[PDB]
Amino acid sequence: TTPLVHVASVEKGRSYEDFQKVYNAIALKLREDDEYDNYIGYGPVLVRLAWHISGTWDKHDNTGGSYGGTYRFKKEFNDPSNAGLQNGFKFLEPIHKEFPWISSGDLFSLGGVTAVQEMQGPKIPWRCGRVDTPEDTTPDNGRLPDADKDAGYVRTFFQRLNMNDREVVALMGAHALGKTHLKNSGYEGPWGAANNVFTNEFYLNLLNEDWKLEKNDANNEQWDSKSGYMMLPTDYSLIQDPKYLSIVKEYANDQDKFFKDFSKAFEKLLENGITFPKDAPSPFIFKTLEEQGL
Amino acid sequence: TTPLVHVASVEKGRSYEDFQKVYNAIALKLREDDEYDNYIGYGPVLVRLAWHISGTWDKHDNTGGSYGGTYRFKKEFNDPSNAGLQNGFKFLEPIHKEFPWISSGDLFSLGGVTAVQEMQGPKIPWRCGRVDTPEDTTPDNGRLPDADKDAGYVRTFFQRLNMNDREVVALMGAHALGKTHLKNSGYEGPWGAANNVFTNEFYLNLLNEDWKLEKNDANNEQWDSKSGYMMLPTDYSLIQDPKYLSIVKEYANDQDKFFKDFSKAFEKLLENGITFPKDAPSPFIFKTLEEQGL
Amino acid sequence: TEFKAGSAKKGATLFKTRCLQCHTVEKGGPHKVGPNLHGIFGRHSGQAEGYSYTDANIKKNVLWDENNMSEYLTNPKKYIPGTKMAFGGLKKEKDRNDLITYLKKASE
Ligand code: HEC
Ligand code: ZNH
Ligand code: ZNH
């Protein structure tokens, strides 16, 4: 009979050029408002936002995911696992006032694709068609992963998102971006030095640094290195598990392979739960600000 | 008085492979001894050397040129205009002892071809067969041009080398390489920023930079730019004469046309004075170090 | 010059947030992810001791003066292609002049 079918419906009248304009607006504000979070900028919080709105998906009943844009509603907004993300929402709201036609899900997911590309990351094909759903369909709190867990948890959690080993290791590489904030998650510090430039640094740091398990100021345990970097227990679990470890090594040695796998996995993450019709256009690959001469 | 015939004679039993081996030895030493002259390397001095030995040629009586390899002797070795070239000779002598069968003229001219190719320049066809001639075939000093000069002098000088307007403007493009040293020629500074890579920068700088005639520490006058580049009066004469100017504009816009014309003119320069038998093998195009894996 | 001169106090905040995670400005200082930036003004690209640079940063060999440094910090992988400097770029002229003013006083 079947689950929730979330059919994609392109916004009334819009095409590639219209979405390139939304990308351009997000990309420009990313360049302009560069002072945020001690000059890291809004890039990392935008990709975390794109992930958190997507990560609520449950493959078993097709609830959650990026489709509904349910983050705009109270329950999901005040999820404590979403602390810090309100800055990403505040960034995106004047862009939503500039383009009122775009759905909440399309804007939230486009924000992530824009951030990765603008931080010199791989091109991430993106599809439009997410439609805003009522307040009903708002997923319950607790669907996002806990950072204080092991490899078995990471593997089992990501199965709910239809992600295999390669896809989860690839997806976790986004931790090369930004930092953990004590006030938000109870964890403190960056995973790397290049906070706002997408690289394979996550995997290089996991392998090449000497990690030690210490307690932070929120009494949570994290893995810290002498260089001033940190790893959540879920990040460090990627080198404790033998199958995850070989993929971490593969990506530390090959940034091109990481880019290609991340691009596919991130697009899948943002598209999970959406049924795209066959009359629907092929995925859009947006031109960066640099490619447009900026 | 009546003209000197210089017949090319291939070194007994030597072919393509033998010369590729000499090319590889020069090329490897070029990569190894990269410390020299503030990391510019020995590349530029090798092409300057190939030009200096070839530029001694006089078409009217067929004296000099690359054939005899007469630079090794005292008279042409201590010519003032040859100041700084001793380094090129010092570089090539262990390669000569490694391959004692190769003639001096062949090694000197091959050093130039090797330098151009290894610095990402055009492929320059090269012919073997130069034969070592004695101390008295050694040309008198003052056959190389004076830098202090104008367009009319440059034209008339190059007529002695059977070079037309296109050939001389193309040849002067080698000035994209290295620099002038006060202790050597009485001129100081580079013509461009990309000193160790063969490009059309000489022409781009000659046209796009704001030049000012200034006196140097050796009391000679040169044209200087605010970017720290210089032009010899003979170089600047290329934009003072209308015929040379059109060709400078042409090469500044089209690097591929410069590459093609330079290869032809450089080969002609290195072959001036030599009579090749129909016998004799076809010109060799050597593979670069990169093309061989290395 | 072609570049102006700003506040060394702002450039201090710009360095501790965008450069310190890889660089250090005192004499005889540590080589972290990036080199020691002391004495970088008046020196050629890739001449500081005890560090393994890329072949692209060595072969560019430009004298680091306040003007060609501004062209570097705006887009690092454009001016020197193939460099391992993972940096986004200082797009604002004010952010560039303030940082150079600090680097002129801290690295000399
Ligand atoms: C870490 C991820 C970096 C950040 C952020 C910044 N830089 Fe850096 N820088 C880094 C590396 C790994 C290197 C070496 C590059 C190579 O190809 O080997 C550099 C180099 C420089 C240099 C050149 C040094 C020299 O050639 O002698 C300079 C002048 C420099 N970096 C400056 C600089 C400034 C002022 C920054 C702050 C905004 C900055 N860098 C950030 C790595 C990283
Ligand atoms: C296992 C799983 C997991 C986990 C648990 C996590 C967790 C987390 C945490 C805790 C944090 C912090 C917050 C704060 O602010 O403090 C983060 C961040 C984060 N994150 Zn992540 N993650 C993850 C995955 C992920 C993914 C998948 C992605 C995508 C792709 C991401 C992206 C992110 C980012 C980018 C960030 C940033 C933010 C900022 O900086 O702002 N992420 N993260
Ligand atoms: C007109 C004409 C002429 C003249 C005058 C000249 C001149 C010259 C001079 C002065 C110099 C300097 C030296 C020193 O070191 O100081 C040079 C260099 C020189 N050069 Zn060039 N040239 C010429 C041509 C030429 C040519 C033709 C070529 C080739 C092809 C050349 C190549 C050269 C080089 C490359 C150099 C650089 C070197 C180094 O750096 O080492 N060249 N020269």
Instruction: Using the CA coordinates, give the radius of gyration of chain A.
Output: 18 Å
End-to-end gap of chain A: 51 Å
Number of helical runs of chain A? 13
Reported for the largest beta sheet of chain C, the result is: none
Architecture of the largest domain in chain A, CATH level 2? Answer: Orthogonal Bundle
**Which CATH architecture of chain C?**
Orthogonal Bundle
The unique ligands bound to this protein are: heme C, protoporphyrin IX containing ZN
Helix/strand/pairing category of chain A: mainly alpha
CATH topology of the largest domain in chain A: Peroxidase, domain 1
Main CATH class of the largest domain in chain A: Mainly Alpha
Percent range for β-strand residues of chain A: 5-15%
CATH homology-level superfamily of chain C: Cytochrome c-like domain
Share in β-strands of chain C = under 5%
Secondary structure tally: strands of chain A: 7
Based on DSSP secondary structure assignment, what is the total number of beta strands of chain C? 0
Assembly status: heterotrimer
Number of helices of chain C: 4
Number of structural domains of chain A:
2
Q: Find the biggest chain interface.
A: A-C, 17 and 13 residues
Keywords (chain C): Electron transport, Heme, Iron, Metal-binding, Methylation, Mitochondrion, Respiratory chain, Transport
Main location (chain C): mitochondrion
GO biological process, one term (chain C): mitochondrial electron transport, cytochrome c to oxygen
Subcellular location (chain C): Mitochondrion intermembrane space
